[PDB]
Every structure is written in structure tokens, then in C-alpha cells.
Paper text:
The overall structures of these PL7 alginate lyases are similar, showing a β-jelly roll fold composed of two antiparallel β-sheets with a deep cleft. Structural study on several PL7 alginate lyases reveals that two loops around the substrate binding cleft determine product distribution.
The structures of the PyAlyH125A-M8 complex and the PyAlyH125A_Y223A-M5 complex were solved at 1.62 Å and 1.70 Å, respectively. At subsite -1, the three-dimensional position of the sugar unit in the AlyVR91A-M8 complex resembled that in the PyAlyH125A-M8 complex. For PyAly, loop1 consists of residues Thr108 to Lys117, and loop2 consists of residues Arg159 to Phe170.
Numbering used by the authors: 27 to 145, 150 to 241
Write the structure that this text describes.
Amino acid sequence: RRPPWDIARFRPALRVAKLQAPDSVQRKDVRSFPNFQADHFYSENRDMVFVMGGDSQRSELRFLDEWSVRTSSTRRMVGVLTLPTPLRGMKHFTWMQVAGGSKGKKPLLRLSWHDKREQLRNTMLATVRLNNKSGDAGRFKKIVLGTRPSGRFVADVRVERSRLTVRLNGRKLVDEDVGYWTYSTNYFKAGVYVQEGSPDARVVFHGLTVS
Ligand SMILES: O=C(O)[C@H]1O[C@@H](O[C@H]2[C@H](O)[C@H](O)[C@H](O[C@H]3[C@H](O)[C@H](O)[C@H](O)O[C@@H]3C(=O)O)O[C@@H]2C(=O)O)[C@@H](O)[C@@H](O)[C@@H]1O
């Protein structure tokens, strides 16, 4: 294992992100990536690997740029990644987001993996929030993205002129108006953020770029 900053292709993303992990694991978000590696964030096989176990715990990059959905020029996150077979007991985790930040407070978009869902096994999901309310007042659009691929796939999230799109391996599976989401604190996230599962979840990035 080596520091993902050793693999040059990850430098553009790492220059404009910081790494978040539990307060029991690091005191503060990591902002300087040269020479940095840990059990939750390391490179093997020239990839950038995130690993975290336990409900509500993350190892995730928080992109530093904050923006509004009204943006004139496309805001885009494109990943080439693998979700290796999850361990027995891992039920639900998130691997990319459009996070709502300090004003939005909830994520506009989560891309997640689930052992089991009803609307399905070994299934990926896009959740687009229709408001930022908590509890029972929360409203959502749930879009089924299909079975977890067994190897690499391309995930491409774009927001432009109030429209959110997701393309998985070139297929546009999400295309929604988001103009209701007025908050100006949105940013991209990528990595692993466990919702339900004691064991470790692993998310393997082969490439990640924002624009
Ligand atoms: O998979 C389902 O269809 C599932 O939806 C469940 O509620 C979701 C809810 O829609 C929302 O996506 C929520 O997302 C949370 C996220 O889990 C995380 O905690 C983050 O901090 O905040 C997100 C947010 O507030 O948007 O996750 C819920 C979930 O537990 O999966 C239920 O409605 C369930 O009945 C249904 O099967």
C-alpha cells in the first residue's frame, strides 16, 4: 500500500478536496495529501481505495468548491470505479453524492449500493431529494440504476441550468429538474459512506475528476 498522491492521475481531484473520516479516526479533515495513507484511504494496484465499516461512518472526499444548481457552466464529477463484492452483513452504503452543505443540510443526490431493496438484490440506487426536510416530511425520487457491476464502470454526475443528470457507462439513467433546490452550498463527494453494515465496505477508484 502507498499514498494515493503517489499516483499522479489522482492529483487534480486531491488538490481540490479534503478527506473526511470518523472523529475517532482523525481529528480533522485531511487537506494535505502528499505522503498520506491510512487503513481507510490508500492506494494498491495504482487505484485510490476507500474503506470504512460501521453504520453512519465514512471515508470520503469532500470537494472544496461550493456551487448552486443554477450554475451556467456544467458542474461535473466523473469516476471510473469498482464496487467489489460487499462482505456478508454490509447492507447499504453510499459511494458518490451531491451534498447540500451548510445551508442544504441533506444531500441533493446519493448514489448507493444495497443488498436488498423493494421498488431487488445487489442493486444500485440514485436518490434525488425533492426537499431538505428531515423525518417523515422528507420527499425523494428513487431511481433504480441496476445490478452492481462486477468490474469497472464509469459514473458521470452533472448539474447544469438547474438539471441533474447521471450517466452509468454512458447510459443516462437520471435526468431531473432540481431548480427547487436553491441552496448555494452544494459540492461533490466520492468514497464510502456506510448507512447500514458493521463490516468494512470498500470503494475502489481507478480515476476521479471534477470540473
Ligand atoms: O431503499 C429505500 O427505498 C428506502 O428508503 C428509505 O429512506 C431513505 C431516504 O429516502 C433517504 O434516501 C435517506 O438518506 C439519508 C442517508 O441514508 C444518510 O443517513 C444521510 O445522512 O442523509 C440522507 C438523507 O437524509 O437524504 O436514507 C433512507 C434510508 O434509510 O435508506 C426508507 O424510506 C425505506 O423504507 C426504503 O426502503
